[PDB]
């Protein structure tokens, strides 16, 4: 179906503790494929998925160059930004960049992204048109004017509409068995009585891919959102995800409740009953 490639950069200034720490991570959908850490011994972009391991040294050379160039720009920008907000050398600060593109089932460009954040708060973002910028504050307005004069949006659009989608095509072909997979969830149910008249009914969804799942509780057919607890979709650590949904039910009425699991990897939605 529709796919996405995304990159997440983090630059953290460490005063007195040397130079800023730069961490870069690359994703194709919910699969982390590349990494870079300024603290690691390698000082190279490293593979984190089997399908990217087939890339030659010319790929790793270019990726390392790009990522180090941004780490160096962030090193200077950290200084510039503390002059903007008039902050001391004393404090530790954070620069975060998110960028990428979404493709349709045809493998053609849909939408592109580029957004920056200083100290967790939105700084500057490239608009949907990929031609204009949105500055979140007065400091960001200076960056906006600089980026407007330098025609930064044209260069970003050229990547997001161009090279970004072309890499995604290459990645989707080279990792078809992994990226185009639809792992269905391993469902099971647990019952734990809290009181003599109340009980917790918990429904599990394990080892599924992609991360997109829908867990819903129903009482005799009617939807149930009252007394329902949900956990954030968590990684299993093997490239699959986990999620559970619980409901507090009156003792003896456990058979009335049904859990409905909705996932891409399922031919039809599952119905679980205690």
């Amino acid at each position: 179906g529709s796919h996405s490639m995304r990159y997440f950069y983090t630059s953290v200034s460490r005063p007195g503790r040397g130079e800023p720490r730069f961490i870069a991570v690359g994703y194709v959908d919910d699969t982390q494929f590349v990494r870079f850490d300024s603290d690691a011994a390698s000082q190279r972009m490293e593979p984190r998925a089997p399908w990217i391991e087939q890339e030659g040294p010319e790929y790793w050379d270019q990726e390392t160059r790009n990522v180090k160039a941004q780490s160096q720009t962030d090193r200077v920008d950290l200084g510039t930004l503390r002059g903007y907000y008039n902050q001391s050398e004393d404090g530790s600060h954070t620069i975060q960049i998110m960028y990428g593109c979404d493709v349709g089932p045809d493998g053609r460009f849909l939408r592109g992204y580029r957004q920056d954040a200083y100290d967790g708060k939105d700084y500057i973002a490239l608009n949907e048109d990929l031609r204009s910028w949105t500055a979140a504050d007065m400091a960001a307005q200076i960056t906006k004017r600089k980026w407007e004069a330098a025609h930064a949006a044209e260069q970003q659009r050229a990547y997001l509409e161009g090279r970004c989608v072309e890499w995604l095509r290459r990645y989707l072909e080279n990792g078809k068995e992994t990226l185009q997979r639809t792992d269905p969830p391993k469902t099971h149910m647990t019952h734990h009585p809290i009181s003599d008249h109340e009980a917790t009914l918990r429904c599990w969804a394990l080892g599924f891919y992609p991360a997109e799942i829908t867990l819903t509780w129903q009482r005799d057919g009617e939807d149930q959102t009252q007394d329902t607890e949900l956990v954030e979709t968590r990684p299993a650590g093997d490239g699959t995800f986990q999620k559970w949904a619980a409901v507090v039910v009156p003792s003896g009425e456990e058979q009335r409740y049904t859990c409905h699991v909705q996932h891409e990897g399922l031919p039809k939605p599952l119905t679980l009953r205690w």
Binding site: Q32, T94, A117, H192, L206, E232, P235
Partner: protein
């Protein structure tokens, strides 16, 4: 400045079965800044050789990490997770429950 408390989740890769080899996971998320101390505990003692995922973040710039170690669960042994951040006054300990 943006300061966000980490959300902690202690769990296993596969459903817990005594004597069988598994992975103890600790998923810290929703936090800001990135500077975090996450340790996995076996009966209050720090587990050595605990690996972690590469630092990544959410659409709202909140960081997330997965700390993991290979372990074999037993009825006797108590597993937990010690997490510390600037938002936490003292290390927060979340016990591992076989059904959470």
């Amino acid at each position: 400045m943006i300061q966000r408390t980490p959300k902690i989740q202690v769990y296993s890769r596969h459903p817990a079965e005594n004597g069988k080899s598994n992975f103890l996971n600790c998923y810290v998320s929703g936090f800001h800044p990135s500077d975090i101390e996450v340790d996995l505990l076996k009966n209050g003692e720090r587990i050595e050789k605990v690996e972690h995922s590469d630092l990544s973040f959410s659409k709202d710039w909140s960081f997330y990490l997965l700390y993991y170690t290979e372990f074999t669960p037993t009825e006797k042994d108590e597993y937990a997770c010690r997490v510390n951040h600037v938002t936490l006054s003292q290390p927060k300990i979340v016990k591992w429950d076989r059904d959470m």
